[PDB]
């Protein structure tokens, strides 16, 4: 019934180091997904590739074109998706990776009715390579998939409790914002997602939720009970 | 007329770090490749993925199946290949990436006859995804691609000048069996046997000394160790 899209930056998979994949961190995440699946919540997941490679970072040397740097990023998300698939299935869950870039040998291609059939049979669906367009941020791609599958909400999983007024690291006086309007997110200096993603979520009336997942049982509490610790853009 | 396969470990492209892609290193390699192309040497490149993911490391703990780890590693090689291509195209080299695993939108598949065709036209071919099979090594993949394209030799580009006994001497020439028997490792056993069976010489040399590669291929000089 309740269908959600959980979005992670690649860094979520890395832990204390900025690079790679921390196996312990991965298992932890998968167990938070498992609690959703056990409570009959349908879970789509998108993951960025920032733990492996970045668009404005590999291009700044002066020899990697903008599009090729993105294609490197897209391949990275597929690497992360396979890892996540494995962590999910290690703990007994059924999962499919639906990639926007065709790699038949490693995962299924994204097809609208296939992703839905999987979700309706209770499989976790991980969307690899966003939507295949290089120009889009992870946030935009996740919001797109979230609309495409008719999700009830999109969860942006971060390392921080929710949406704040200033960066919690750069300010002691940083105050968490519990509920925000789409426009409050657009005009204000504070950042949630990029402008395209927020505007996409606004027009299609998709609620955005920003929460920590380091907290055991929080995700379930957020999705099923509208409880736990989170921020909501509505 | 001379044809060559050059093998890089993923770790090689990471530079002064264990992880990632060093753009100064890729530039350096592109220049060396350029000197081969401009001297009419046909160049195939096989690139590793260890700077990003290795399947063995990935399977520790038993969360990721060894097989899925190896595919993750094979994808990482395509990422390196793509960055390698951009470094080459940047200095005006015509290149093609071919992957043992089909990634339709980003590069062409490995096709025996096309690879050769690209090389006849003076293009650099970068082979990603190794053999396309898990459980095999970059060394094996490189040796395979080398024999497939009809290489005059395979060059294992490493950080060291040649083959040594420790990380107290350097070893100039080696038999295939000497490489299969001894504690000194050049590549893994399956790559060496593949090379032996097909009479394919193996050069081990340093990637960082300028003009060296050109001298090994064109003149059989410069600094290097040889398994034959
Ligand atoms: O034919 C292949 C080629 C590579 N790989 C995987 O991808 C990585 C290759 O990159 P690496 O840099 O490690 O080669 P090496 O460093 O060992 O020379 C390996 O760890 C393997 O898990 C594979 O499974 N089959």
Swiss-Prot record, chain B:
It is an enzyme of class 2 (transferase). Homohexamer. Gene3D superfamilies: Acetylglutamate kinase-like. One of its GO terms (molecular function) is ATP binding. It is found in: Cytoplasm. It catalyses: UMP + ATP = UDP + ADP. It comes from the Bacteria. Catalyzes the reversible phosphorylation of UMP to UDP. The gene is pyrH. It comes from Helicobacter pylori (strain ATCC 700392 / 26695). Keywords: ATP-binding, Cytoplasm, Kinase, Nucleotide-binding, Pyrimidine biosynthesis, Transferase. This is Uridylate kinase. UMP binds at residues 49, 70, 131-138.
């Amino acid at each position: 019934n309740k269908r959600v899209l959980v979005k992670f930056s690649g860094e979520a998979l890395a832990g204390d180091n900025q690079f790679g994949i921390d196996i312990h961190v991965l298992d932890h995440i998968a167990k938070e997904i498992k609690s959703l699946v056990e409570n009959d919540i349908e879970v789509g997941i998108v993951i960025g590739g920032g733990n492996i490679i970045r668009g404005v970072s590999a291009a700044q040397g002066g020899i990697i074109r903008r599009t090729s740097g993105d294609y490197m990023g897209m391949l990275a998300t597929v690497i992360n998706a396979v890892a996540m698939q494995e962590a999910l299935e290690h703990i007994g869950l059924d999962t499919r990776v639906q990639s926007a870039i065709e790699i038949k040998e490693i995962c299924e291609s994204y097809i609208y009715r296939k992703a839905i059939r999987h979700l309706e049979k209770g499989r976790v669906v991980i969307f690899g390579a966003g939507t295949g367009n290089p120009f889009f941020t992870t946030d935009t791609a996740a919001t797109l998939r979230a609309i495409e599958i008719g999700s009830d909400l999109i969860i942006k999983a971060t390392k921080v409790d929710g949406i704040y007024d200033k960066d919690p690291n750069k300010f002691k006086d940083a105050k968490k914002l519990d509920t925000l309007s789409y426009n409050d997110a657009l005009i204000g200096d504070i950042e949630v997602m990029d402008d395209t993603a927020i505007s996409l979520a606004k027009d299609n009336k998709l609620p955005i939720v920003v929460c920590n997942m380091f907290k055991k049982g929080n995700l379930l509490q957020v999705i099923k009970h509208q409880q736990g610790v989170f921020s909501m853009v509505k």
